[PDB]
Design a protein around this ligand. Structure first.
Ligand SMILES: COC(=O)[C@H]1[C@H]2C[C@@H]3c4[nH]c5cc(OC)ccc5c4CCN3C[C@H]2C[C@@H](OC(=O)c2cc(OC)c(OC)c(OC)c2)[C@@H]1OC
Ligand SMILES: NCCc1c[nH]c2ccc(O)cc12
Lengths: 377, 384
């Protein structure tokens, strides 16, 4: 039924973001467990975190003709196979080499599942009005999975073991497939104008703060904070709660006070939050700056997503998910460059210099948002 | 007696800054009985001369104390206001403005130095400067309408005669409290100024003050011309358009002088520079007078934040690194103030005719924004 595809797409996006967030506080702690010095391993940790983003990067365009040739269900189903294999590989992983392959399959399955499920949702709903509601429900499921995943893996590692949240995620995925078992202006012309490129760089630089924080904040915590091993994923809860509050709030506020002002203020608070992050000497210090950073990224997304839609609509022709490809290129850009470059930058210089560099980059990029106010064509 | 030094500087900056803004709506209307440029050179005569006397005023405070410079500032302000009251031509009004400049330089350097010296606790010192800047904000707030209504009703010399009487009362108060009759040299030999320009920290703080006050100082000469060119506003609203900046500057300087210590000086300066840059960014987007109360109030709050944060941070730096002599650093701060006040009004029309007002606002705002993260350098400067 029409509701069935909605529930399977909701579950798929939920589990995908859950895997993304659950991999975060397990890898550094798993690395700590075996060697029983992370400055030498941090660069490969960053590469292992960016592998999914880079593989997704090379795999986005190929799904396009593949969707047309063989429909939408089969790419949706194969996404299941890849993420189920990635989940079982994550739980049984004992070697770094296996984990890199699992991250690569995670990227493949995430790209396949996202594109195929969004296309299937577009195909099923042809009423021209409920499509937006269905997309909103799917994105709400994405945000909810983002909120839930980190407390899942962090709490359920030292309490009921290491293979627990991956096995439970695989079981929930198996419930997903049982439910599912029963245009123009290409993106490489839409990157041809300075306005859309500035907006994409805006979203990429806004998300690069959390992208660079994810590989390095847990290792920073075990090196100075001495926090308990169950608290690492809990230490990112402000970045999700404040993100949800900010994204809901600024959306009504955004149009009254201008989208460009929202984006500029969001980048300013992103830079300030990243600067204020490396001074905390205990976990309660991180709640302020991390909550501010989450609210900032929520403001930036809620201001720049409609401005990207307006920019695509006013000059070019957009589709149901034409804005999807541009933003995801920024997200994969950040999650491939920030994690990869971050290991080298923390090996060469300290983590505080990394945070200062990212904050300064956001601050200097902040004045460029004037370019988007009333653009012409 | 530690509190009685704050009330003196509270009234010294009140009267001297009163004559700065009262003369603004009284000189070009009086002279009327290329011409705009000669009028604008009147205003910047204080700003140019005060910049040069400042390097000779700062080190002078070391060798004679702080009382005599403030007494001389009282005398010079008395002479400047009296000469303003009677002079009725350009060459007679230029010397009066330069005299007001020299008096303002004396009063500002001596007052900020004596507040820094008598207030030793850093959090406690962060409050005297805030209230003194509040008195300054109230002075520039009441200066313009005072001169306007006095010139409309009671005459031209009367707003300057009353200022002379208040200056006489200020001199009596100074002779009662401070006793400026002897030259007292500071026991500690203060550091030379040109070593202090080799400190990155002092240069960054002075640059922050200079860029914020350049942002405020560029706006005042250039805003009313753009107003008449674009919105076609009646003349009576011109001075009222800048009132929220003064009001917000007073409120912000009091409030953030209270909390700059709890919230953090570097974060206060950074947020203030960011908000002043953003406010100048949205200033040339106003399509009527009602759109300017917001950004102007934000600009005033930003400048009050940056001023209350960086005003005691200079004393903090000079105590953490250099010797405990405060004349030179606050002389540099007043130099930054006067440099911003000097580049603005003489070159405002030239820059507007060259590139345009919105591009000037964009340039100043982007300069403030990119200079903002350099204030993170002031988080914890190492000691000697
Ligand atoms: C991880 O997986 C993601 O990459 C998602 C998130 C990335 C990032 C993040 N990661 C964290 C990990 C944490 O634990 C350590 C803690 C906090 C965070 C935060 C806080 C900040 N944050 C944002 C998250 C949001 C998701 O993006 C969308 O919701 C979205 C919205 C849209 O418009 C409504 C779109 O347009 C239709 C769209 O498609 C282009 C996507 C985004 O991509 C799917
Ligand atoms: N130093 C405070 C700058 C300033 C704030 N408000 C003002 C009003 C008028 C003026 O000439 C200057 C100002």
């Amino acid at each position: 039924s029409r509701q069935l595809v909605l529930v399977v797409v909701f579950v798929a996006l939920l589990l995908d973001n859950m895997l993304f967030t659950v991999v975060v506080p397990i890898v550094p702690t798993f690395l700590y467990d075996m060697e029983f010095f992370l400055e030498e391993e941090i660069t490969r940790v960053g590469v292992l975190f960016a592998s999914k983003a880079v593989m997704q990067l090379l795999v986005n365009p190929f799904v396009g003709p593949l969707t047309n040739r063989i429909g939408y269900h089969i790419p949706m189903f194969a996404g299941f196979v890849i993420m189920f294999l990635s989940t079982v590989m994550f739980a049984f992983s004992g070697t770094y080499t296996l984990l890199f392959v699992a991250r690569t399959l995670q990227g493949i399955g995430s790209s396949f599942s996202s594109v195929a499920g969004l296309g299937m949702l577009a195909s099923v709903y042809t009423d021209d009005h409920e499509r937006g509601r269905a997309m909103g429900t799917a994105l709400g499921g994405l945000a909810l999975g983002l909120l839930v995943g980190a407390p899942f893996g962090s709490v359920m590692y030292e309490f009921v073991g290491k293979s627990a949240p991956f096995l439970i995620l695989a079981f929930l995925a198996l419930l997903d497939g049982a439910l599912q078992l029963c245009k123009g202006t290409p993106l490489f012309m839409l990157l041809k104008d300075p306005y859309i490129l500035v907006a994409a760089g805006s979203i990429c630089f806004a998300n690069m703060g959390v992208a660079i924080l994810e590989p390095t904040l847990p290792i920073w915590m075990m090196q100075t904070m001495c926090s308990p091993k169950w608290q690492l994923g809990l230490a990112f809860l402000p970045a999700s709660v404040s993100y949800l509050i900010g994204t809901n709030l600024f959306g009504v506020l955004a149009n009254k006070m201008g989208r460009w002002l929202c984006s500029l203020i969001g980048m300013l608070v992103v830079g300030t939050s990243l600067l204020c992050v490396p001074l905390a000497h205990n976990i309660f210090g991180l709640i302020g700056p991390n909550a501010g950073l989450g609210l900032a990224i929520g403001m930036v997304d809620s201001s720049m997503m409609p401005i990207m839609g307006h920019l695509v609509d006013l000059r070019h022709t957009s589709v149901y998910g034409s804005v999807y490809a541009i933003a995801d290129v920024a997200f994969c850009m950040g999650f491939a460059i920030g994690p990869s470059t971050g290991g080298a930058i923390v090996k060469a210089i300290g983590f505080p210099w990394l945070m200062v560099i990212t904050g300064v980059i956001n601050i200097v990029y902040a004045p460029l948002c004037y370019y988007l106010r009333s653009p012409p064509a």
